[PDB]
Symmetry: C3
Subunit: 306 residues, 3 copies
């Protein structure tokens, strides 16, 4: 079992400085040793340097850094595509969540039947026509879903993207801050999700059962886990750009990762939105990065029973 | 759609200074905008000024401020009754919990078949003969329950109260600090409650299901939600006079409020016992008031899924 | 009902200074009054003074303080035996968890069909041949289980010990930090446990039901509750030597204790590993000691409903 680790220091998917230091903070929290201890054979690609784009003006007076986010994701997809083809399970460290455009596109290139577990306080499914922020980290799913493309206009730097996934192939877990147009999109296309409310009702065990039943109940498929650290309650993960009260507990996050591992199907994992500069202290920064390592390690087989 | 907001800066139901600043703190946390955004048509009655009573001596060498609490509740009942009769759902901001004597009486003046969901760490059902503190905020239910009246002596200032609400018409949620005579009363009159222990066992979904079955399982009834902020764990709501460890989680509180909304029957809501002066910091004060706004907003339709 | 309180300041079962002050901190947090209030007739044995052993060198260049731990446990066992035979339910305040060798041996001396509920983040079942720390507080179960005895070598000071528990007679609750050799031992001897993961899945109510089914499902047996404070999440019990994130909530801890009380079979209780010196503040120390008093009180009948 080989694991590739890729640092993707994206910040241009949003407006708050510092999320580009996420990958280093996660490494400093001891990621590599933890993965080695589980018996992972590791390839560290280091932190990628993405090619900047000159004069990357607003798109339609609203969407920020479209060409930069586009090109960085194109380059990221290439590295992800290569690593999977060489047989690595791919861990990408963020960086803001717009990089899921790149990792999922790269992952899907040769594994078009992949499925997605998107763990997040947010749906990240605004389109360029519904976003109220202009921040691409709140739009990545819209570029990836096949059924939505008639409603997603073409952004500069995005033409290389071929929507690779059906709306029945993504399940959300932990949603509690959803824009009305996203709610419309989720219902209109029958996209399955388990909000914090669904977790309160069902418990995390049944949520995972039903998640896997929806996605792999009929056939084995490579799993893409896109994990936004803000899925966790801000008391546990404060160092992040859009914290929302009432998130996953520590145990719930571990349980999710444990079940991901137990399928035997994890093929790629994003760990995004850790922003050490948004912590009010270095303990808060470190606790967030430490939590990130716990998720990744649990996702690759670390247990709570030895 | 119409919602009335009434500030009741009640402190004489207890002895700790500052709870009378509860309504202002909740307003400053943005209550009105939150209600407006949900589509509530709003009438703000402002903060009431209650008529003082001269020489309001202890009753029986124990019960404090009886006439002041009695008259203030009489005046509050008049305002609530008027607002409910004009078609408003009535939100009352406290202030200590003795004001539920006024809001429930006033509410019942219009809607006599109302039922009550009492969310609280405490039962608040001591009588003047059982109270060990003399504080009327730990007695209000005793003046309201029809089955108890012959064990409830007549206090000065209380003669206007005609308690018409049956013991089968109130359900408690969150109880963990119950005085022995209150335990006796709950058992002797077969009053239903879900303690923190019951929540631990059943989970909050089943608790709400069973609550509504008991209250509205046979017929539709207007619901009075009397929500003591101290139902929440002290970590989440520190700014309150009688905090008790082991309370509701944030998610549990939201879920209760959501189920209240989903009945379509909410006719009045109390949000009581926020005391900004008991916070160790402005942050603890603001988090408590923000939490109060979350409960109220969720009770009137705010969701965690957009 | 009669309860004996025994202070056991031991701290030679591990390497961190200050756990020997655990009993005084628990007493100072109001233990005796809380117990009196429940109707417990109390005998206070005070804090025992254990006979020191000179030149108590490492065993096999690894195991620390063996004769000291051996002798202190012999002396503790005598006191527990005497108290149980004289009709007391026995509360032993620690002190590190190696003293369970003594309390369980003393208890089993005249109640040989006793069963054990071990509430702990850890399995405490390393042997002198598997421990990586040499600390006896992480080995006590190995000296107590009949089935393990041919693989547990003879330590100086330990010859008085006669293993008094079959592997089907102990159930663990709360495990999240288990050494691989301990995991091997647990599976190899089919010792039943409920990890934090099991609690996440089943809920604490089902965990307790199944716990009692296994232990007392066919016959009534005296119950020995060995409660390591570190079973609780570190946010609730920070003053302890080996904290592990993702522990029991406050409510879960109370629920365990309530269910122990509800069997009517509790015969002895250990409350171990409170180390007030490990708190970063006096507040952190007191909250840990207060939590310890809450467990003990709930185990002898304190309720959350009056
Ligand atoms: N839905 C979001 C949040 C996206 C977060 C992206 B992620 O990747 O961390 O899930 C988007 O930008 O599209 C926002 C949309 C609406 N805004 C509301 C808001 C914006 C600014 C302020 Cl000051 C207060 C409130 C915040 C959430
Ligand atoms: N049951 C109470 C508390 C009710 C709180 C009212 B509410 O509205 O906040 O639910 C009452 O005054 O009737 C009290 C009755 C008993 N006392 C016990 C006590 C009093 C003082 C102290 Cl310092 C320590 C303990 C505290 C609770
Ligand atoms: N299993 C333990 C801990 C048992 C704790 C006993 B108790 O009573 O508090 O449950 C043992 O000493 O046997 C240890 C075994 C392994 N070590 C790992 C470790 C040791 C030292 C350091 Cl600095 C970092 C990690 C710590 C736990
Ligand atoms: Mn997010
Ligand atoms: Mn996201
Ligand atoms: Mn209360
Ligand atoms: Mn109250
Ligand atoms: Mn232990
Ligand atoms: Mn332990």
């Amino acid at each position: 079992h080989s694991v590739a680790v890729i640092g993707a220091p994206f910040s241009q998917g949003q407006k708050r400085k510092g999320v580009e230091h996420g990958p280093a903070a996660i490494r400093e929290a001891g990621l590599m040793k933890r993965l080695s201890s589980l018996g992972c054979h590791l390839k560290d690609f280091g932190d990628l340097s993405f090619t900047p784009v000159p004069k990357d003006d607003l798109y339609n007076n609203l969407i920020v850094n479209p060409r930069s986010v586009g090109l960085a994701n194109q380059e990221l997809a290439e590295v992800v595509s290569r690593a999977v083809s060489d047989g690595y399970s791919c861990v990408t460290l963020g960086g803001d969540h717009s990089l899921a455009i790149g990792t999922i596109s790269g992952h899907a290139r040769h594994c078009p039947d992949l499925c997605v577990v998107w763990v997040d306080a947010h749906a990240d499914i605004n389109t360029p026509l519904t976003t109220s922020s202009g921040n691409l980290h709140g739009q990545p799913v819209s570029f990836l879903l096949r059924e939505l493309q008639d409603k997603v206009p073409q952004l500069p730097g995005f033409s290389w993207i071929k929507p690779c996934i059906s709306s029945a192939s993504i399940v959300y877990i932990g949603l509690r801050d959803v824009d009305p147009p996203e709610h419309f999109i989720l219902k209109n296309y029958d996209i399955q999700y388990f909000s914090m409310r669904d977790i309160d009702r069902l418990g995390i065990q049944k949520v995972m059962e039903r998640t896997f039943d929806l996605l792999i109940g009929k056939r084995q498929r490579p799993i893409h886990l896109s994990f936004d650290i803000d899925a966790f309650d801000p008391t546990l993960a404060p160092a992040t750009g859009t914290p929302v009260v009432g998130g996953l507990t520590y145990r719930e996050g571990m349980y999710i990762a444990e079940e991901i591992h137990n399928t035997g199907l994890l093929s790629a994992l994003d760990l995004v939105e850790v922003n050490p500069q948004l912590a009010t202290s270095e303990e808060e920064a470190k606790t967030t990065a430490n939590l990130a390592v716990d998720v990744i390690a649990s996702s690759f087989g670390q247990t709570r029973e030895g």
